[PDB]
């Protein structure tokens, strides 16, 4: 009767619905009873300190468990042969064959092999022993304590910031661009120059000696002279053995392009010069806005003045400044969309341009990292559109936004929604038609009648970057060209060496299978965008519910009248787009993984011929690669893939259990539960025990959420077990 | 493993006693009128 202390409506519900709804609304502070704007911003500030502390405790735990139970020093000696260890296993349910099967890694106890890549990251940035991994874990424990204390401190009466502080856009932008982005990039350039690069060259540099060991022989003298190019002299030779002094140069800021020939990773001096230049650019960017000294820009003035004089944007951005500042959901939507694009860039650029030593020979780590960050990308993108819908319902005032870009968006929302509908159908009809074309015509024994379109546009982009594989001579590919001649003295030789070796993933060769899967990805993107945009733009109202904004973001329906109104809320458009996000990330990661396992085996022609029809995807990718995974245990024994083999089935179970919540709805279950209430009250020796909360069937929206969670969790667990075990079992 | 006794001490506690105690006290908290 008092658990939802933030909601008196839920704390007076006498059913089990009160517990579920109290748990599901806990972080939605804006809707809690008696919430002012002061208190909303101060609780968000403190819980941001608590989230940071959770992130630092997670990082310290990974460092500690690797320092304690890992084989980091043995892996450091021989990184292509040793398999990195994550943490040890202590499970009293294990049989002795299970204990033996998990005792890999060169150790004497059962253990998990790490797929996260933290070994390659920590090796590249300097860590060499277990004792500096342990030093880093104690530093993160200290930082976690500092940020827990700061979160508590800024909830104290004297240290609680005012709303005038929380809405200072110009001071926060100046500090986050020049200090949080720019200066910490400059400090990371310092770490690479002072620690990572010297230890990549055999010289230990730690806190005990870093003040008496110069990064460069000349040493901060070329910097204070303008002889900056003296810092690029003598780069690491192509004979350099990473971690040792043999073949090592003295440069710290050289730009060479391409990959270190032995680690197959970007040069550490390219990375150090990257972070120095990013640091300078971002520090300059962080002096744009006026804070206290009369120079700089007002964000309000810039937004107000950008109305095109032709009038095509209406009033332009007048009033956008206040709309964005007052709406935390608008800020969240912008942040999540930006973050989603970046974690997709991280996934794309980290497989094509790896920065960590000896990674990209860890096919399991490479596959898991790509899959991980694309799924994170899809979740962040769905969340950005969800919080834009919450913005329109809750925070958007049509009268402070008269004839804005926002109001004019809502003014032509049917043009937007119908053209997404057309492009989704246009993509879907023909992409599926060509796939089914090739399927049918290959089935009849005639693969030469397939419709195989060459992806000439992307091949021309690859050639513009210097790929000499398709005989297009435009731009960099030509020996003589202004583009090619301009970069010749700096990065162009190493970039052409990197892009014209078929031994990496830089601009992988593409064909008709890549054309067809790219169009399928485009269809999936435009359809997920359709569902989310339609949810955001119809959130305030539609023709079925012209007053939809009076009911909120998440409500079950408006009843069976007017034909029926199931899934009419904007929340239900989040719900429906979650399936399409899962589908698109499935198509993306299936494509990435099949193309890479065929390349890593040496059999790229298997992808090239089988990817153009759907039976090729079914038998040559799912069916062919399932066999090491589903044989992790069998009536003849078990091996170390037994856990993924169990997770695989586990994933199939949760996913299917989600169907029960998604197909069967409330009325059936409430009537069953009433027969169970009767039976408990009439059974002797059992009616001595009474519920405090009346058992009820789950709510309509809650059941949608539970089915979505079960579906999504089954999706993640099944694919994770497959992508890790099939790549492990094959090693290729 | 160094301090090898620690998993056999902490894993039963973290895996059984810790959830058993948070479930017991959460149950008390969610089922109290005041």
């Amino acid at each position: 009767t008092k658990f939802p202390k933030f909601s008196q409506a839920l704390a007076q519900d006498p059913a089990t619905r009160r517990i579920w709804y109290g748990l599901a609304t806990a972080h939605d502070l804006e809707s809690h009873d008696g919430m002012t704007e002061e208190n909303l911003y101060q609780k968000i500030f403190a819980s941001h300190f608590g989230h940071l502390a959770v992130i630092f405790l997670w990082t310290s735990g990974n460092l500690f468990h690797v320092a304690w139970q890992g084989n980091f020093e043995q892996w450091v000696l021989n990184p292509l042969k040793v398999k990195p260890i994550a943490h040890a296993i202590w499970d009293p349910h294990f049989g002795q064959p299970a204990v033996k099967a998990f005792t890999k890694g060169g150790v004497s106890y059962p253990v998990n092999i790490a797929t996260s890549g933290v070994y390659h990251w920590w090796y590249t940035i300097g860590m060499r022993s277990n004792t500096d991994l342990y030093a880093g874990s104690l530093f993160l424990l200290f930082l976690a304590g500092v940020f827990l204390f700061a979160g508590w401190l800024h909830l104290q009466p004297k240290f609680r910031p005012g709303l005038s502080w929380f809405k200072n856009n110009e001071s926060r932008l100046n500090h986050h661009l020049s200090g949080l982005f720019g200066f910490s990039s400059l400090a990371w350039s310092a770490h690479l120059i002072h620690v990572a690069i010297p230890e990549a060259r055999g010289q230990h540099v730690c806190w005990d000696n870093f003040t008496k060991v110069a990064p460069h022989p000349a040493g901060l003298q070329p910097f204070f002279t303008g002889n900056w190019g003296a810092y690029a002299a003598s780069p690491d030779t192509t004979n350099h053995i990473f971690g040792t002094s043999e073949g090592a140069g003295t440069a710290i800021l050289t730009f060479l392009g391409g990959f270190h020939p032995q680690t197959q990773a970007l040069w550490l001096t390219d990375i150090a010069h990257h972070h120095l230049a990013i640091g300078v650019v971002f520090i300059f960017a962080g002096h744009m806005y006026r804070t206290n000294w009369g120079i700089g820009h007002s964000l309000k003035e810039i937004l107000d003045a950008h109305r095109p004089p032709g009038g095509r944007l209406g009033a332009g951005h007048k009033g956008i400044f206040e709309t964005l500042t007052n709406s935390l959901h608008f800020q969240l939507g912008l942040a999540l969309a930006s973050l989603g694009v970046i974690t997709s860039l991280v996934a794309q650029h980290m497989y094509a341009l790896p920065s960590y030593a000896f990674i990209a020979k860890d096919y399991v780590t490479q596959s898991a990292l790509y899959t991980h960050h694309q799924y994170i990308a899809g979740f962040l993108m769905v969340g950005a559109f969800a919080h834009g819908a919450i913005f329109f319902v809750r925070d958007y005032d049509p009268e402070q936004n008269k004839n804005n870009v926002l109001a004019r968006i809502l003014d032509h929302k049917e043009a937007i929604i119908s053209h997404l509908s057309w492009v989704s159908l246009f993509l879907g009809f023909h992409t599926l038609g060509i796939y089914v074309h090739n399927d049918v015509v290959v089935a009849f024994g005639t693969p030469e009648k397939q419709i195989l379109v060459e992806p000439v546009f992307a091949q021309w982009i690859q050639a513009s970057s210097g790929k000499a594989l398709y005989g297009f001579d435009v731009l960099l590919s030509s020996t003589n060209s202004v583009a090619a001649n301009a970069s010749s003295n700096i990065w162009l030789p190493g970039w052409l060496e990197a892009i014209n070796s078929g031994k990496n993933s830089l601009f992988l060769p593409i064909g008709p299978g890549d054309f067809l899967i790219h169009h399928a990805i485009a269809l999936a993107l435009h359809t997920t965008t359709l569902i989310l945009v339609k949810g955001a733009l119809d959130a305030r109202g539609s023709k079925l519910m012209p007053d939809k904004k009076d009911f909120g973001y998440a409500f079950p329906c408006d009843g069976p009248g007017r034909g029926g109104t199931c899934d009419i809320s904007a929340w239900d458009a989040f719900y429906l787009s979650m399936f399409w996000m899962l589908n698109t990330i499935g198509w993306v990661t299936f494509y990435w993984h099949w193309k890479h396992i065929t390349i890593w085996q040496g059999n790229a022609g298997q992808f090239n011929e089988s990817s153009t029809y759907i039976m090729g995807w079914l038998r040559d990718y799912l069916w062919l690669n399932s066999s090491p995974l589903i044989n992790g245990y069998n009536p003849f024994g078990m091996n170390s893939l037994s856990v993924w083999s169990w997770m695989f089935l586990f994933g199939h179970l949760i996913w299917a259990t989600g169907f029960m919540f998604l197909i069967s709805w409330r009325g059936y279950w409430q009537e069953l539960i009433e027969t169970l209430v009767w039976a408990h009250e009439r059974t002797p020796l059992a009616n001595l025990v009474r519920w405090k909360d009346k058992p009820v069937a789950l709510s309509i929206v809650q059941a949608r959420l539970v089915g979505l969670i079960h579906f999504t969790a089954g999706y993640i667990f099944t694919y994770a077990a497959f992508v890790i075990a099939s790549t492990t079992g094959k090693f290729g | 493993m160094t301090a090898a006794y620690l998993p056999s001490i902490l894993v039963p506690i973290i895996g059984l006693i810790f959830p058993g105690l948070v479930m017991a006290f959460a149950f008390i908290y969610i089922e109290q009128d005041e």
Binding site: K43, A46, S47, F49, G50, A53, L57, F64, A67, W68, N130, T131, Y134, S137, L138, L141, F142, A144, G145, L148, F149, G151, W152, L155, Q156 | T2, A3, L6
Partner: peptide, 30 residues
């Protein structure tokens, strides 16, 4: 390698962090 005493130092600092997390959680809870 890591000594058990080093593990015990780590456990002390994590205990201090648990105490600070409880206090922050109580402050947020009001």
């Amino acid at each position: 390698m890591i000594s058990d005493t080093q593990i015990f130092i780590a456990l002390i600092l994590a205990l201090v962090s648990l105490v600070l997390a409880i206090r922050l959680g109580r402050a947020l809870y009001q």
